[PDB]
Ligand SMILES: CC(C)[C@H](NC(=O)[C@H](C)NC(=O)OCc1ccccc1)C(=O)N[C@@H](Cc1ccccc1)[C@@H](O)[C@H](O)[C@H](Cc1ccccc1)NC(=O)[C@@H](NC(=O)[C@H](C)NC(=O)OCc1ccccc1)C(C)C
């Protein structure tokens with residue numbers, strides 16, 4: 001695809017039989033989601049935001065379809081105001097910024 | 100150019116006749132920049148993201164060069180831990196997410 005940026009880059013993501021939407025986010029080191037019935041336990045983490053720092057729940061080896069493409073990685077769950085797909089998962093599906 | 104994303108996409112910018120580096124941020128609705136005086140009048144605004152909210156001086160019709168591409172737009176001035184060229188100005192230089 002070749003997505004223009006006049007609106008938010010929200011794409012259909014799927015994860016362990018859960019259809020959702022998410023934000024392709026070139027300024028996000030990590031992928032961060034609001035909830036999902038993920039692999040039980042989670043090693044805790046801290047992530048950096050514009051308005052301070054938040055505590056999240058890290059889950060690894062996570063299979064996720066993004067916009068068609070398959071991806072494997074580290075989905076954090078945290079108090080995010082929108083499902084964010086960061087560079088860790090954007091790399092694998094070949095996603096690049098262009099101008 | 101075509102920017103892969105294994106690292107942060109920081110680029111050279113020129114703003115207020117001052118050279119900076121700044122992160123190309125497709126999740127950001129607005130453009131946010133660290134302290135500096137710009138010309139013209141500002142008006143208060145709060146923006147929010149991860150961690151919570153910050154306060155900003157919003158400036159308008161602010162001429163800005165980005166990886167050597169000219170652009171007029173709204174630019175927010177406030178204490179971000181990083182300069183962010185969000186979607187408002189990305190649409191001007193013709194930026195797209197390609198995969
Ligand atoms: C996703 C995170 C991992 C990411 N943070 C990082 O990658 C940081 C630097 N690194 C990191 O987490 O590494 C691990 C760690 C941290 C420190 C040391 C060791 C361990 C991040 O906060 N990403 C943001 C940029 C950033 C990075 C460096 C430091 C400061 C800010 C935007 O790209 C990202 O797009 C966010 C997510 C998002 C998108 C849209 C909606 C709300 C939040 N947007 C924003 O912060 C922007 N806000 C918006 O687009 C609009 C204007 N506001 C909004 O819709 O907010 C309403 C909202 C606020 C409050 C609660 C409910 C709703 C923007 C203006 C800066």
Ligand SMILES: Cc1ccc(S(=O)(=O)NC(=O)NC2CCN(c3nccc(C(F)(F)F)n3)CC2)cc1
Nearest residue numbers: 001002003004009010011012013066067068069198
């Ligand atoms: C391989 C390939 C090359 C070129 C193209 S394109 O057709 O010249 N450009 C384009 O289509 N832009 C927009 C429309 C489709 N869209 C999108 N693309 C993928 C996945 C999702 C979804 F649903 F999950 F959200 N949405 C937004 C961008 C296509 C394919």
